[PDB]
Amino acid sequence: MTYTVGRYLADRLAQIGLKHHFAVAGDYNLVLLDQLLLNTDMQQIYCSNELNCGFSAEGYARANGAAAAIVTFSVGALSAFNALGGAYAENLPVILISGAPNANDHGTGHILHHTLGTTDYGYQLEMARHITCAAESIVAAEDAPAKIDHVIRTALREKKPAYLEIACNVAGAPCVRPGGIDADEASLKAAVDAALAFIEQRGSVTMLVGSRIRAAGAQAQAVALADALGCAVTTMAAAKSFFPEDHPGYRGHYWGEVSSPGAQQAVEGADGVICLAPVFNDYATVGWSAWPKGDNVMLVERHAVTVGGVAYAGIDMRDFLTRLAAHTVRRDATARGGAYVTPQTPAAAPTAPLNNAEMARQIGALLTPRTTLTAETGDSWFNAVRMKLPHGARVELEMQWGHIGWSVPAAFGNALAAPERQHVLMVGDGSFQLTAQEVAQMIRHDLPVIIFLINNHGYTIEVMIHDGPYNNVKNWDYAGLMEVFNAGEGNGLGLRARTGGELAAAIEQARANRNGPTLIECTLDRDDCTQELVTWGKRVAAANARPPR
Amino acid sequence: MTYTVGRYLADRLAQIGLKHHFAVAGDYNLVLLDQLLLNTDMQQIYCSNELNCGFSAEGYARANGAAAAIVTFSVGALSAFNALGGAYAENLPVILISGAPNANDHGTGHILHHTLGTTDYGYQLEMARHITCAAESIVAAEDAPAKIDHVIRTALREKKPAYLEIACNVAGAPCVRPGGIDADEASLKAAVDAALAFIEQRGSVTMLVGSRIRAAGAQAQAVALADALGCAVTTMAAAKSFFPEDHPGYRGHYWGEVSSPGAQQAVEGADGVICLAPVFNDYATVGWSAWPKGDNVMLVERHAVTVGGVAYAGIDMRDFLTRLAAHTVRRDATARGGAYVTPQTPAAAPTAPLNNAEMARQIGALLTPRTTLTAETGDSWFNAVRMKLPHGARVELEMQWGHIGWSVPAAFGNALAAPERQHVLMVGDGSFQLTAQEVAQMIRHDLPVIIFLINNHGYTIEVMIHDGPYNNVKNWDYAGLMEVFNAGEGNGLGLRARTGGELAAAIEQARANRNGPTLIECTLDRDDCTQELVTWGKRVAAANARPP
Amino acid sequence: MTYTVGRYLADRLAQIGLKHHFAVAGDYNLVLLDQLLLNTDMQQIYCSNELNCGFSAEGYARANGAAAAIVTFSVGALSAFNALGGAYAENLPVILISGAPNANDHGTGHILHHTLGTTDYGYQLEMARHITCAAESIVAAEDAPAKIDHVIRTALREKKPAYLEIACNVAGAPCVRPGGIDADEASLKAAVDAALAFIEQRGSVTMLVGSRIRAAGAQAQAVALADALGCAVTTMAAAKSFFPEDHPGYRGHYWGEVSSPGAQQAVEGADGVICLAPVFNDYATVGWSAWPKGDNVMLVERHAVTVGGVAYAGIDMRDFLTRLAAHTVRRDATARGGAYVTPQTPAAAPTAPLNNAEMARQIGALLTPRTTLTAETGDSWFNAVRMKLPHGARVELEMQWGHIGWSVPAAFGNALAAPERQHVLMVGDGSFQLTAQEVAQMIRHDLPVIIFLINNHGYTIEVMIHDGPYNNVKNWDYAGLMEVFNAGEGNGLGLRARTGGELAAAIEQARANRNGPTLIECTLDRDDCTQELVTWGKRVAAANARPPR
Ligand SMILES: Cc1ncc(C[n+]2csc(CCOP(=O)(O)OP(=O)(O)O)c2C)c(N)n1
Ligand SMILES: Cc1ncc(C[n+]2csc(CCOP(=O)(O)OP(=O)(O)O)c2C)c(N)n1
Ligand SMILES: Cc1ncc(C[n+]2csc(CCOP(=O)(O)OP(=O)(O)O)c2C)c(N)n1
Ligand SMILES: [Mg+2]
Ligand SMILES: [Mg+2]
Ligand SMILES: [Mg+2]
């Protein structure tokens, strides 16, 4: 059986540790999908639509480290681009492979199906270059190994996604086989010496862990530096779970005036803040109100540290933090005697109407060290950041891209990447409507994801930035949807919870559904949301609206 | 009270004839949506997601002439771009407007939500320029009139979509008000004389009507020319319904070896073919096998005619066709003796298992002159092109872009644009799962769309180009979905038809459902499809696979 | 004195070893040029126009390793882009820095001078992304270190050029200071083991050295492998000088039917060819006639080797060649008893009309181990590739980009990068007309470049692909131009040579001009060119013209 270009790609994807890749068929990729099916270290997973395909691969990469999605030219890839730009924003090496016109059509002027109807077939690549770290087109088998290895090696080095298109008559063409793997003292001393003087010369220091720290591979080194300093540690909201909440120095999330108790003063009252790989965007800074920077910040990024008025280039954040931790003095003033303060809401009477605080209390009680909680944009961001996490629990947030509906397909991909964990999904009713059909794929693969669907009858987070008729949604019977997707062949279970007692019974049933997803539709009033959402929403709306010049 | 940049856009959109625009809210567009709401000539319609928002605008433009969709930066617009590229492919002036960063963030290096996380806000405009005829960004109210009028005037002139983004703090900023409207004889003589010579020198001439003729506004002039020539007239598959099927010269669709009976010889056996605004792509030419071109073809395009070895530029197709029809000789040889042959499927025994031919027969019987039949990519293309159309019936096909799932939001937008017509949607089960949630918006607006969902358990069209496990889909209870979307406040109705008797009884219940959509889930075997799909699919596949 | 963004860039450019950078002033870069003037490890050099500016930096990088050019927005940068795409094509890390609009104009709709007159100021960056490996815009000083270090570190790693624009009011803004520096066994064993089996299983092997081998840093390792194998070694034309011509295995250039004697048979008659970092384009393959590839080629590239039907990724060409050389058996059949054969033209009678072969004989006799010979596109490519090189002599060719006129500004930049060497420039009269004014800069800096200007009254190389009235040029008094550029303040010398005796006397005078350039205008008939030009020109023209499908 002749070895082909598509096999070359399949074998490299398996080699970088994918166990699955995601696809939607179209004639320009069918031979490629057949070549990928020959690799039996991976399962080929089919998605309902390409936007869902792309966010399933994004969710898979959060657990696995990388992922791949394969789509057809133009009508598949342009939807997958929203999710690919999402992977770029969230520092995940997703490889999007699109099927593409037969190479013999290049140079002809032939107009081809799925294109704009002009002689141009390069617009899709051109568009992809704006949202990836590498983008290549294979029209000849002899070029395929260099292009495949370039796109995979660059994506994995940068932790950013990349794009590959393969002419449809070349996916099955003969190719060579893959071999090998796609899977500075003075500078470091100067940077470490400056960071040690920054700590030593201050009376108090607090660490603030940012949401690029996973992409830097530096989470364990952050803990070593926290152990050595004994300082208060806080996380930015989008870094929820990236630092252990049972560490004796952890004091919660820093998010300006919506911080955990004590955390705003820990960061803003300290003589120096050590910021590890942050994303200071308008939402994270609460409309530019909460943004530690400048001479009293040691800004540590994946290949540079800026401290004491100097940017030290050429140093790896991991080696830096390890050396700094081995030599620093202790600065424990912002931690001593303090603790991380989490909500302590008393249980509601079981028959009272369900409210947000009761629902969040029951969800937080479900978390284990083995839980992965995917939380959608909406008030679920604020309920998730408020949860006290058992050590080992993972929270996945998409706070820089913020595409509502990401969470459904992302929970499906994560559940396939990490089947040993307990997957829990918190998604609002508005977000659910964009990508709901990927629950039918959860059902198809008997994945036991527990989904809390928060039915507050519209886009409550927008109701709290700026209200209007556009925040209303058509209501669905969300719980009844599960039987519709099972269609007599599936173990999906849909339950409704209108009280704390109904929610607790629904949760018991969900935990007992071992071979399919359970959706629990939790009914809340439209204005029953976290206080933090309202305080943040005000500040961020005022920032968006601020008047020209 | 103070007139704003978003009211200037709203008023221009109303001025070009929109009665609706489509939107998905996000913080970058809310002020803009509040300004659009002030125009009471339009209704603002909310969509489940942005791919569906864009394709509802595309289906609305097919009936209305134009459309607009409003989305938020990046997370909204990048999915709407698939639909915008689809409006370019299908020659429809959809205007996509996206909300965008506050103008005071430009020049700062601020990182913003919904972006790539870099200091770049211009990637979205840059991407949009590849799929539109005009693309502008407003960051200052002083510029907004020239940029709104350039995108709308260019889109309407070119019959192609356009892109506008408006900084979120500028949509509510004061603006001037809109006034005025956004809504060669020697060359024509030379072209008409060469075309007259082309016809007079030939004994058998046939017309082939192409799917860019509606973008040219030349459908009535094509009828005038067919009346003068008396010749056979055929339509390309994607031009279904663009020429009237009761015309005495109509001889059905030309589609190479899957043509209506006699139509392949009408075109391929003629001494000349008059080709009106065709798209000869790989699917239309049946893998490059069926492609009339060259010295024996008069190729008539929007602004140019190529005939007799010369390309005549600067002539409007409408004026050309009217002058040619007024002077031409008659050439009726290709019509003599012939007729349009359409399927004559006998009615099945009512309790026999449903098959595709029976389902197609009953859907064909439902069509009227006031029907719009939206037909999805899949075997529904072949069942639609085979339908005998009453004069005036409209069929909508998306055969150049061909994005499965387009039909659901496109039928929703066409139902809002043309509420006086009877809307019928044929959609396959695989396609329905990409965009199904827009049926909930049909229910929200009480639109009486009758939807035939063909449940043959997978992607049968693909099963016929090249089969594999990727053609299987997770089955749904499609009928039972209607009550889920009603959620106690809607008039959607879901029915199942497993026999011709059950299908006839479901169609009569669907016709009686006047205030909400009815989905009839028709069960067919995977391999029970038209013969034309099988024949077309193998040619088309062989062309895709041809070796380096 | 406050440290600024422009200083940050100046100090990083000095740190990567530039001794000069090239500039043309415009109001959008004047404050930046003032910040660069503060670094006294570099000289700021002014160019006549931006295309010349960009090719002076390209020539400088060939000697130095890297280079920088600074230009004004749009009217400067778009000309510099031709030279930047040239640097990409020739694998040289040139950094182009453009001055750019004031940051406060972004977001205003202001129309600005030097732009297209629309509200768009991003088109220049967008265009630059197609011809560089990194492209960034600085509009805020706090972003400047990351963007500067990203563009320099990426350019130096990739050996490709990069682009940076800096808002004009930010070049002088305060900035932090620069610290630190911008300056796999199993895979390697598998690749080496396969390459050793490739050699061992064959009776004869020949090495073919390609013009990407400098960018790979692998020239010394190629010599070690040639020493170990004892095989015939040949160079592709564009690799002239990248392998030592006095090595006992060297047998000249392989260039199909225009190869050195014996070299075509060495490569095409061998059982296996080891190809080191080649560029097989239409000119190198002589119109696709001479292109060793496939199962009998070991293709060695900077990070991959393809041999024995496998592409081994993840291995550095230098480590690979060193390990291969340490273990290979000898395969000397294609070298034994052979020698590199070079032209042996007898000296012309001194008073006979000068002809090409006599001119090339005198130029070849001028070369020393310390010579850098820059040779322009035209018949000078074929005269240069025919020269026998003393060990250490460098030849610079621009055979992939092939922009006529490159050679003038490239010889000026090289002469500044490497003033310890003897610089010689061979440029035809047509090419000279595109960029002649950079000889006035050679004069301004007293650079003793000897220029042979071949005046054959038009574009003789095109006359031999396809003749027409477009191959004629307006003749100039090239030798008289030198006094015009000196304008009473310069040591440029212009001489004419119409015979071999006049050329020899002119050369003596040139060698004696120690403080300025000498141009010797050599008069040749239009059809007096190398035989190789005519044979190559035919083949490459036939390839260009070959008929649609
Ligand atoms: C693709 C996309 N379109 C629009 C938005 C704007 N958006 C941000 S939050 C949100 C509503 C989320 O509503 P829901 O999921 O019901 O969450 P709630 O706040 O009610 O819990 C919207 C429309 C977005 N973020 N992404
Ligand atoms: C967005 C998109 N992705 C993938 C494709 C490839 N595609 C062409 S037809 C088809 C299947 C259509 O299946 P169905 O709607 O069930 O129609 P059938 O042929 O079964 O009646 C596919 C997947 C496409 N055209 N568009
Ligand atoms: C910028 C640019 N424009 C046009 C060309 C096409 N070109 C290739 S060689 C050449 C003529 C070179 O003439 P000359 O320098 O007189 O060299 P000769 O062959 O006569 O020695 C031309 C015009 C090119 N290579 N670069
Ligand atoms: Mg909600
Ligand atoms: Mg189907
Ligand atoms: Mg010349």
Numbering used by the authors:
A (entry chain B), C (entry chain B): 1 to 183, 191 to 556
B (entry chain A): 1 to 183, 191 to 555
Excerpt from the publication:
Pyruvate decarboxylase (PDC, EC 4.1.1.1) is the enzyme responsible for the non-oxidative decarboxylation of pyruvate to acetaldehyde and carbon dioxide. All characterized PDCs are dependent on the cofactors thiamine diphosphate (ThDP) and Mg2+. The quaternary structure of GdPDC is a homo-tetramer best described as a dimer of dimers as for ZmPDC and ApPDC.
GdPDC crystallized in the monoclinic space group C2 with cell dimensions: a = 129.1 Å, b =141.0 Å, c = 91.1 Å, β = 125.8°, with two monomers per asymmetric unit. The refined crystal structure contains two identical chains of 544 amino acids (residues 2–180, 191–555), each binding a ThDP cofactor and a Mg2+ ion. As for other PDCs, each protein monomer may be thought of consisting of three distinct structural domains: the pyrimidine binding (PYR, residues 1–186), the regulatory (R, 187–349) and the pyrophosphate binding (PP, 350–558) domains. The tetramer is generated by applying a crystallographic 2-fold symmetry to the non-crystallographic dimer in the asymmetric unit. One of two ThDP molecules in the GdPDC structure appears to be modified as also reported for the ZmPDC, based on weak electron density for the C2 carbon atom of the thiazolium ring. Interestingly this seven-residue linker contains three proline residues which likely add rigidity to the region. In GdPDC this loop is shorter by four amino acids, foregoing all the described stabilizing interactions, possibly contributing to the lower thermal stability of this protein. The lower thermostability of GdPDC is presumably due to the smaller number of hydrogen bonds and salt bridges between monomers compared to the enzymes from Z. mobilis and A. pasteurianus.
